[PDB]
Amino acid sequence: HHHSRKTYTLTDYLKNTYRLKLYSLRWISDHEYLYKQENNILVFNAEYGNSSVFLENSTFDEFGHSINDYSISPDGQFILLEYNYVKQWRHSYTASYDIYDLNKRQLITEERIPNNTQWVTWSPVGHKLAYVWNNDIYVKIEPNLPSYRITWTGKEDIIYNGITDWVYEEEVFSAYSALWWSPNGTFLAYAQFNDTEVPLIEYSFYSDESLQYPKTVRVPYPKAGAVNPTVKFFVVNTDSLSSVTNATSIQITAPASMLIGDHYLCDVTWATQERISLQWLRRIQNYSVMDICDYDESSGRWNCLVARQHIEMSTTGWVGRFRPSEPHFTLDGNSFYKIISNEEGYRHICYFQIDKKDCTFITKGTWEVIGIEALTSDYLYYISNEYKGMPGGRNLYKIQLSDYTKVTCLSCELNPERCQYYSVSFSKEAKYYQLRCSGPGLPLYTLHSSVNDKGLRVLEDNSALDKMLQNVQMPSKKLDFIILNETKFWYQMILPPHFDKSKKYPLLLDVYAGPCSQKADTVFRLNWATYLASTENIIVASFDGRGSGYQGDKIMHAINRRLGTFEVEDQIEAARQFSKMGFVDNKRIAIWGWSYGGYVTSMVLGSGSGVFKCGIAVAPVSRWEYYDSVYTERYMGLPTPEDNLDHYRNSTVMSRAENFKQVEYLLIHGTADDNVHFQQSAQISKALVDVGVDFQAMWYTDEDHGIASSTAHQHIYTHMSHFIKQCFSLP
C-alpha cells in the first residue's frame, strides 16, 4: 500500500545506488568561481548566479592524453593540465604537466614541465610557476621560457627540496608540498629535508602477475625513538633570478632553543610581502616557538627578532590538537589571531600583537573553536561547536574585531532541523561564502553575501536523492550523552528503521578513539553502518570517551603518555551502559575499527571484559614502537627506560593474546600498507598462534592503509558483513 519495503542493502553501499550530490567550486576572484558540469568547466558570477562556459570539455580531446585535473593561473591567463597521475602516499603523487595559453588557445610546446614531476604551483598572483622534479626546485617566470634551477642537492630518499619526506608528509604538513610563495610571488620560501640516516621500512610489492620476482619497496620511515629527518628553511627572491648565475637561497635558522636538540618545522605562514612567520616544535612536542622574520632591504636577508618570538607550550600534554595552530595575520601584519587552549583547557581565539608576549582571548566558554576561516578588517569568521552545547555540531560565527561582545552565528538558524554541521568556503576577499551543511539531514549547499549575510541561492539540495529514499527504510541517528564520573560523554547510535526500544538488537561498536577523535557528531552518512542498521537490524554505536577531542584538554589530555588505557577502558564501559539502556541483546555485542580503531578493537577484545562476543580489526596498530616517531612521541614520549618504555611495553596487543580465547576475531591488513605496516598485523597473528587461539584473517595483496581500490573495498566489506552476520546468527 505504498508502504516503504526497501532497505539500504550491501549492494547499495557497494554499487553506490544512493549518491550524495556535492557542489565543489573553486573561487578564482572575489566575485566568481569555477564549477564542472558534464566535464565542462563553467565560470560563475556569485552575485547574479549566471554562468558561461569557461572551458568546453572538448578543448583537450585532441590532446592524446587523459586529464586528471587542472589548475588555472591566478591571472586567468594560463591553465595547467595534469595527466599521467601516479599516487604515492596520502598526499604525494607524480604527474606530467602541460600548460595551455588561454589567450592564444594553444598548448605550450616550448620548455615543457618535465615528466615525473612531484609538485607544481602557481604564484599567488600572476603566472609564475614553481615545480619539484627529482627532489630539486625549479622556477618559470613565464610558461614558455626556460626554467631556473633553484636547488642542486636533491637526491632520491635522502635530500628533499620543496617536497616533504614520509613523516612530514603524513604527520606534520598533511601535504607533499614544502614550498610557500610570498603573497605577491616575489619570494619563494622552501623547506629542505635530509633523511640520510633515517631507517627504511621494507616490504614486498607483488604487482601484476606478469612480474616474476616481487619488488621490495624501501621508504625512509622513522619508527618511535628512531633517528628523525633534519630540516632547513630557505627563502629565495625569484624577481632577482638570472640565466648566468645560480640562485641565492637565504637560509633562516631555527631559534637557539630548538637547535639544542631534535626539533620539527611545524608551520610556515606568510604575514606580508616581506614578513614570514615560522613555528618550530621540539621532538618532545610540549614546547614550540613561533619566529616572525622580516626581509632586510639592504642585506637581501631575513632577520627574526627575538622580541617577536612567541612561545606556546603545555603542562598537561602536547601542543595543539595535532600540531600548533596556524596564525591569521591582519593586513598590516603587526597582529595575528590564533587558536590556543585557554586557562581552563578550552581552545579559543587569542589575539596577539607581534611585539607582545601576552595575548587576549576574544572567545571563551566551555566549548571550542574548530578553525579560523577568514579575517577582514572588521570581522573574524570562525567555526565552533558552541551551539546548544553540542561538541559534535559545527556552525559559522562572525565576531566584530572592535567589540568582542558582538558575536553572530551565521549558520545556526538557517535550517535548524536539517543542518547542524557546517563548513564554509569564502571568496578571495571574503565578499561571498559557500556554506556546506553535512547533516543531520541531507547535505545542502548554499551561497551567501557577507555584506549583510543574506542567502543568494541553493546551489545543491540533494533533492534527487531525497526522491529516491521516499520508500526506503532508512535508519536514524540518536545523538546524546551519558554522565560518567559526573562528566558528559557523547555517543551516537545508528538505529534500524521502526526502532522498538522494547526489542533487543545486536550492537556493533564502531570505534576509533584516537587522541582528539570525534565519532559522535551530526553528520549524515551513507556507509556500512547504514546497511547494517537498515538491512540487518543491527544498532551501530560510537563513543567519544577520555582522549576524544573538541571538549577541552581535561578530556583530550587524559590519555597523555598513556595510549591503550582510558580510551580502551571507556569503550568497554560505553558498551556496558548501552546494555543497561535495555534495548541491547547482551549476547550479541561486536566491536570494530580501522587503524587506531583496529588497535582499540584489539585491546578491547584482549581485555577479558566478557562484554564482546566478536570483533574486527582492520589495519591495526599492535605496538607503538612500530608506528612513526612524530605521531607516537607526541602522545607517548620516547621508548627508553628513563622516559616511557614501561608503557610502550605495557600497551601492545600481543601481550593480551591469551585473552583472545574468549572471542571471535577477524584481523585484516593490506600487504603494501606504508603507514601502519603489515608488520603490525603479522605480530598479532604470531602472538595468537603462539598461545593457540583460533581467529579469522585476510591479507589484501598490494593494498595500502585505505584498502581503497574498487575491487578490494568491495571484498573487505563483503567479507566483514559475513563475519558480523555469522557472529550475530543472522541468516
Binding site: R90, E170, E171, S174, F322, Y512, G514, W594, S595, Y596, Y599, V618, A619, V621, Y627, Y631, N675, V676, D704, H705, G706, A708
Partner: peptide, 6 residues
Amino acid sequence: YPSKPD
C-alpha cells in the same frame, strides 16, 4: 595519522 585514508 593511523586513520583510514579518505
